[PDB]
Motif scaffolding. Structure first.
Motif, PDB file in Angstrom:
ATOM      1  N   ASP A 283       0.832  -1.205   0.000  1.00 28.70           N
ATOM      2  CA  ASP A 283       0.000   0.000   0.000  1.00 28.70           C
ATOM      3  C   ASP A 283       0.873   1.266   0.000  1.00 28.70           C
ATOM      4  O   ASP A 283       0.603   2.239  -0.785  1.00 28.70           O
ATOM      5  CB  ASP A 283      -0.954  -0.043   1.209  1.00 28.70           C
ATOM      6  CG  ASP A 283      -1.958   1.111   1.233  1.00 28.70           C
ATOM      7  OD1 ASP A 283      -2.048   1.954   0.303  1.00 28.70           O
ATOM      8  OD2 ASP A 283      -2.729   1.172   2.224  1.00 28.70           O
ATOM      9  N   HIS A 284       1.895   1.311   0.851  1.00 27.91           N
ATOM     10  CA  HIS A 284       2.786   2.464   0.945  1.00 27.91           C
ATOM     11  C   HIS A 284       3.379   2.805  -0.429  1.00 27.91           C
ATOM     12  O   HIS A 284       3.440   3.968  -0.809  1.00 27.91           O
ATOM     13  CB  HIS A 284       3.872   2.142   2.003  1.00 27.91           C
ATOM     14  CG  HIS A 284       4.975   3.144   2.098  1.00 27.91           C
ATOM     15  ND1 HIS A 284       4.769   4.429   2.539  1.00 27.91           N
ATOM     16  CD2 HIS A 284       6.287   3.066   1.759  1.00 27.91           C
ATOM     17  CE1 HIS A 284       5.916   5.095   2.502  1.00 27.91           C
ATOM     18  NE2 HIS A 284       6.856   4.291   2.043  1.00 27.91           N
TER      19      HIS A 284
ATOM     20  N   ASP B 158       2.135   1.991  -3.289  1.00 26.77           N
ATOM     21  CA  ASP B 158       1.082   2.061  -4.306  1.00 26.77           C
ATOM     22  C   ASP B 158       1.219   0.968  -5.389  1.00 26.77           C
ATOM     23  O   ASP B 158       0.902   1.173  -6.551  1.00 26.77           O
ATOM     24  CB  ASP B 158       1.004   3.463  -4.946  1.00 26.77           C
ATOM     25  CG  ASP B 158       0.692   4.575  -3.917  1.00 26.77           C
ATOM     26  OD1 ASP B 158       0.016   4.295  -2.920  1.00 26.77           O
ATOM     27  OD2 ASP B 158       1.072   5.749  -4.097  1.00 26.77           O
TER      28      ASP B 158
END
Ligand SMILES: N[C@@H](CCC(=O)N[C@@H](CS)C(=O)NCC(=O)O)C(=O)O
Ligand SMILES: N[C@@H](CCC(=O)N[C@@H](CS)C(=O)NCC(=O)O)C(=O)O
Ligand SMILES: [Ca+2]
Ligand SMILES: [Ca+2]
Ligand SMILES: [Ca+2]
Ligand SMILES: [Ca+2]
Lengths: 197, 197
Positions: free
Chosen positions: B158-159, B161
């Motif tokens: 997630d960090h 992307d």
């Protein structure tokens, strides 16, 4: 156990050296890097030698093949037992890959520019000169896999036209001791024998 | 035993994960990568974290530090005993370094171009998607150092992307199992906890 090897390849030379130091049964298959078989890329997605096959195990990357061989045929041990010395040695191997053998790959690349190859040759001479002061073998008084990994480069200093500082006499005396080892001589191909006396 | 660690560094995260899995006494020293102490470059000529110091031993390169830790504190073993599985695992580690973590370094580099970082993010998603089909843990039914090396990247999808294909559901279920491990949670810094739930 089968090694796919290039007859002038320094990375294959490392694995041949280990195999002859262990003295077990193995087969060498010579691969012409200018005419690679299609199965080379199935075994190794980088499409390079060396590759080791033993039954269902397929390995590439010379230092990883050599770790395997050392563990698979324990005796004689090519690494110290002490976790401290093993860690120091693994770090020396990593730094040689990143700071010396990266330049060796440039010298081995037929497609590399003359300018790139000149920079590589220079960097190897400078690197080896600085390493020359830092015992009988690289890790101490015992021969090890670390000596194995470096030996094909030292064999090739004349071939590569690498010039060392006069301060590097100790490194050259060391290299002569490695090259006198029975398994080192056994591991040379006829093409590598043509590279120096 | 002292680990010099960056609080958001995925390579430091690997070593923190190993240290908490072994459960022995160690100290963590946080290094701000934007304000490095001069002694970092004396310990590590690449001037990066992580670095491990234990008495007179100084190591850098996260996977080499982790090999050392595994050998230095044998139990619990983070590698298989079988030379075959160990060789296969070392090759998986090498390929992750060359094909996944090279892109992680680009995403971590504040100086890298937006275009470079977009290519890196894309390559990581594609690489992980393809790896998703190839057991409970990466080498088989037992947790290993290979899982340790990959876990900080999966924590950061997630960090970073990174978007994976729907076919990669199995990889994501696997990642959740790793992240439930007690030592994984212990190893997270507060900054890394901010990266996902
Ligand atoms: N990192 C590899 C390097 C092997 C390598 O560079 N092999 C060369 C020959 S010495 C090769 O196969 N070149 C053909 C190519 O790159 O296409 C290892 O250590 O085994
Ligand atoms: N190959 C190294 C990579 C370590 C690395 O990239 N560390 C980063 C932070 S995550 C670092 O110190 N960056 C500062 C810099 O490159 O100047 C390892 O695996 O330990
Ligand atoms: Ca010459
Ligand atoms: Ca000599
Ligand atoms: Ca996001
Ligand atoms: Ca997940």
């Amino acid at each position: 156990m089968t090694l796919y090897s290039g007859i002038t390849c320094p990375f294959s030379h490392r694995c041949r050296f280990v195999l002859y130091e262990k003295g077990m049964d193995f087969e060498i298959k010579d691969i012409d890097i200018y005419n690679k078989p299609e199965d080379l890329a199935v075994m190794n997605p980088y499409n390079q030698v060396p590759v080791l096959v033993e039954r269902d195990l397929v390995l590439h990357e010379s230092n990883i093949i050599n770790e395997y061989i050392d563990e698979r045929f324990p005796h004689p041990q090519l690494m110290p037992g002490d976790p401290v010395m093993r860690g120091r040695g693994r770090l020396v191997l990593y730094r040689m890959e990143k700071e010396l053998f990266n330049h060796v790959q440039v010298l081995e690349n037929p497609a590399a520019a003359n300018k790139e190859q000149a920079k590589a040759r220079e960097a190897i001479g400078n690197g080896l000169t600085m390493l020359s002061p830092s015992s009988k073998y690289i890790l101490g008084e015992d021969f090890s896999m670390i000596d194995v990994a470096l030996a094909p480069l030292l064999w090739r200093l004349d071939h590569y036209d690498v010039k060392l500082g006069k301060s590097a006499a100790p490194l050259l005396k060391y290299a002569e001791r490695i090259f006198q080892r029975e398994a080192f001589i056994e591991a040379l191909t006829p093409a590598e024998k043509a590279m120096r006396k």
